[PDB]
């Protein structure tokens, strides 16, 4: 669990200005990964007395290095019951000639299935009966790792699409405050398929409130640094 | 005011003059009542005649009884081993100590020894 | 706290001596002299601590001048009332009352909630004797501790002038 | 000397701005002692105006 | 045993008295004082041994500063109740109750046992005074030990935080 | 929260720094972030025995740096409930031919409606159902941040037009003084159309009361060094 | 201060004879109490007959401890390479020797020479 305290936007931070640094905090991980991060508003909000923080946090993800992916990502759908199909190969574009070793591997498989990879860029994937939702599932064509969607229907109609998660992602609601501490808390996920070396950065808004009920904004930013093996 | 005379922390950090080794830094505890002693001035004077006075170089010296650590050898106090001290008082002032040199060793008796530093300059911090 | 290089009664009681054991319900009370009266310090429940002065004294230097360091050392006493507790032993067994009883965990951790203040404030005090004696079903753990200082001048006024401007005849 | 010029006063400039007491026991994550120096480059040797004045006896 | 550079008289009791003579049945008894209540302390039948803290007291400094050295010193002693046994003669003889008591033998044995828990253990007491004194017919015999050492803070606690970081700044 | 305390022109004797002239405080502030200052005229007003201060105050915002912006500001008008449409391509005069990166930053969105961006310089403002009033939303032309306010009318006849909120602002009333404790307390509001290095000065005009009812005028200034972490 | 008799400043420039490479100027520091001494007229005397005296010419002397700096040879001190000297004492005074000549070198052990300097002229700057 990452733990920040927060400039105090008083002076000393800084010398006032004079220096500035301020470069935005680090933080490191893993692909795969799912972790938490507390930070602490303390230090900026217990001198304006009043009633602490509010529930209006706001984020943004934002790519300084991204290096883009090899294979794409692909997305299918099936009913109820039914078994899925499904190919390899046609999400491998590549420019030299080389050989294609499909793996699926076993820590990122599907939830409510089970995936039989086939001997030349194929797969049959059976769904979990009695169940409706989605599934993902990760593979690793030639080292390069992407994911595969597959939206299982109540048989009806259909089932919309889901947004193809990004590497770096904070859960939608997964965020709270205590305005008796004035600690935020939220979770931080990197997807298996983010590149080591790639750089993020997070910036965060979040708004205070006095006794009246007005509002005081702060902001501020880290670097989502995804490194391999820790 | 003035805050009760007394030390309340000593740090003392070795390093062997042969293998360059560092150890430290470590703590250590007096051994009874007395407080260490000190002399800042690099210049020693001499009473010259009618007033005047003749100012040489000299050497800031240091003179600090604690007790033996059960994990460092003896032969490090007795002026075997590079030393770096730092002492801080009740009152809030700190007083550090860069390449000292044990000179002029006294024989102990392995618990307590009184180390007779002499360094190029110590620093103060007067307090607050 | 007042007297930024020591620690009076009161504060001794309820800063040193309260913290430590949860068995006295902060009943730390300080008193004039421990034996200033026996028959109404010896109403509150079992058990609780008194605190109070022995006698205030010098340490060497002493005089009042203004500027002497005037030295001073106050000798009080922390006097515990513990309830002794027989330890009984179905079969028609029991132990009487002049046991042993364990004064040491009472010293170790009032030493040590007297190292924590020491630590946090820069007040450290001189432990003199240790004496324990019993009456009927009572244990009393008697320590007495001495505590040295130096007395401020307090009056630090405004001062006679601003000086400035003299004057001057050189005839 | 060597690597700056001398301090004017060293008790200002130099600052070990800390948080440690923000930071609780119910996390171990040590680390934030930022230290901020003023800087002034050793002085060194500039314009040197000579102003010479001839003269006989 | 508990405080590894030092004894509490339960210990002493049932380590260095106990083992001891024999003819006690293991009658250590350790007291608050030795001289606390006599009514109840002279009902056990003889013989029997009583151990109790006489005064707890200082061997030099002794301030209390996380780091000091603490030096303490408690002073305790060791009664020996033992019965006198008058000899007779059948020629209608007897040796009166005031007579000589050996004694010598009892400190002998008690400091063998003392010296034998030393050099197991590596902890040494101080011999101070031996003193006798009948009554009746029993007699008793009051040794009077001292012992020293140093108090070991026991908080030693964990430690605020652990450091690491760095990041530096030359401002104007 | 900024705290200063003021040169109380006791005898004037404030031993100036010899070199070192500037007289006015120097306050940093980022982009965005709305702070709270509190400046104690105890130090000025406790001699003047009377009834301290008074809430009749007065502020300026004179600028010194301006750097004026690239991309222009824009309004726009819109009944209730009927969705608006809008450009974002005359907004940005430039001199050199490049490309147009329209962005909307997601922490300084709507208020209350969506916005989608579409592909050129178009956009669609939904506004939020059941509401009658302003709102805005900060877009980055090629890096450059420019502000829309939209104005939704309650279909009746119209509604006027605000005052495009400047670089560096003070809230209408949002400040208070303490007469007990002589303590002025405002907000100091940076709009995220601030360009970073510009400097800005803001003059305070704070009077005091005798104990007749008369005045005690005193003047302060500060220097607002407009910094950035990007 | 005034009255306070000893050295404060001591600048050393080495130019060998052999390949006219310059190194300086590098301040020095004493060994130990003992001062820099002077004799700065050039003109020997020697006492003849009622009254009177036979001035000859003679040189400009200087004798001169210094620590040796770990980063000038040895030999540059030993009387090979030509030196320029400049003092600075306590109460003002600075003497400056230019283009002197080590002469009649002493063993050394590598951590503090006495540099005999022979000179035409020696210059005084006699404080205000």
């Known amino acids: 669990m990452y733990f920040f305290s927060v400039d105090p936007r008083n002076g000393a931070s800084k010398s006032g200005d004079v220096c500035g640094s301020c470069c935005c905090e680090s933080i490191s991980a893993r692909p795969g990964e799912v972790n938490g991060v507390m930070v602490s508003y303390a230090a900026w909000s217990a001198p304006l007395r009043g009633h602490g923080l509010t529930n209006k946090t706001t984020f943004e993800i934002d790519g300084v290095s991204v290096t883009p992916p090899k294979v794409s990502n692909a997305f299918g759908r099936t009913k109820v019951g039914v078994v899925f199909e499904g190919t390899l190969s046609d999400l491998f574009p590549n420019p030299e000639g080389e050989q294609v070793e499909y793996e699926i591997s076993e820590l990122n498989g599907p939830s409510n299935g089970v995936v039989e990879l086939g001997a030349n860029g194929a797969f049959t994937y059976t769904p979990g009966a009695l169940f409706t939702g989605v599934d993902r599932f990760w593979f690793s064509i030639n080292g390069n790792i992407g994911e595969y969607v597959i939206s299982v229907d109540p048989t009806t109609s259909e089932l919309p699409q889901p947004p193809f998660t990004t590497p770096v992602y904070v859960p939608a609601a997964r965020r709270s405050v205590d305005p008796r501490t004035h600690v935020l808390k939220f979770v931080l996920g990197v997807s298996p398929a983010a590149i080591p070396g790639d750089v993020y950065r997070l910036t965060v808004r979040q708004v205070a409130i006095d006794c009246d009920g007005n509002e005081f904004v702060h902001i501020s930013c880290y670097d989502i640094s995804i490194g391999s093996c820790g | ?128 | 706290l007042t007297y930024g290089n020591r620690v009076t009664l009161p504060e001794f009681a309820k800063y040193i001596v309260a913290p430590a054991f949860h068995e006295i319900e902060g009943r730390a009370i300080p008193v004039t002299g421990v034996d200033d009266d026996a028959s109404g310090t010896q109403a509150t429940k079992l058990p609780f601590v008194l605190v109070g002065l022995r006698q205030g004294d010098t340490s060497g230097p002493a005089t009042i001048a203004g500027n002497s360091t005037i030295n001073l050392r106050d000798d009080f006493i922390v006097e515990f009332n513990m309830k002794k507790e027989r330890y009984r032993d179905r079969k028609g067994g029991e132990t009487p009352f002049f046991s042993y009883y364990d004064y040491e965990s009472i010293r170790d951790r009032l030493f040590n909630s007297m190292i924590e203040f020491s630590g946090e404030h820069g007040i450290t005090f001189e432990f003199v004797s240790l004496d324990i004696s019993t009456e009927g079903d009572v244990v009393y753990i008697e320590f007495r501790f001495r505590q040295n200082y130096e007395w401020c001048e307090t009056v630090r006024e405004a001062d006679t002038t601003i000086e400035a401007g003299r004057f001057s005849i050189n005839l | 000397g060597t690597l700056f010029s001398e301090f004017d006063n060293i008790n200002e400039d130099i600052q070990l701005l800390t948080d440690f007491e923000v930071q609780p026991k119910c996390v171990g994550q040590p680390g934030i002692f930022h230290l901020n120096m003023r800087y002034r480059p050793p002085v060194r040797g500039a314009r040197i105006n000579v102003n010479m004045a001839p003269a006989l006896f």
Chains 1, 6 share one sequence.
């Not at chain 2, 150890?23 to 250590?28: D, L, M, N, Q, R």
């Not at chain 2, 033996?68 to 009740?90: N, S, W």
């Not at chain 2, 009152?91 to 002029?104: C, F, I, K, N, R």
């Not at chain 2, 530093?117 to 007067?126: F, G, K, M, Q």
């Open chain 2, 1 to 128: 005011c003035n805050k009760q005379n007394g030390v309340k922390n000593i740090l003392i950090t070795f390093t062997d003059c042969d293998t360059q080794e560092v150890i430290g830094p470590i703590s250590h505890e007096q051994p009874d009542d007395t407080l260490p002693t000190y002399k800042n001035c690099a210049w020693t004077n001499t009473a010259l005649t009618n007033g005047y006075v003749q100012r040489s170089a000299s050497n800031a010296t240091m003179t600090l009884p604690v007790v033996r650590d059960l994990r460092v050898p003896l032969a490090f106090y007795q002026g075997c081993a590079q030393v770096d001290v730092q002492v801080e008082k009740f009152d809030g002032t700190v007083m550090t100590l860069t390449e000292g040199a044990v000179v002029e060793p006294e024989e102990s008796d392995g618990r307590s020894v009184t180390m007779n530093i002499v360094a190029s300059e110590i620093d103060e911090l007067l307090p607050p």
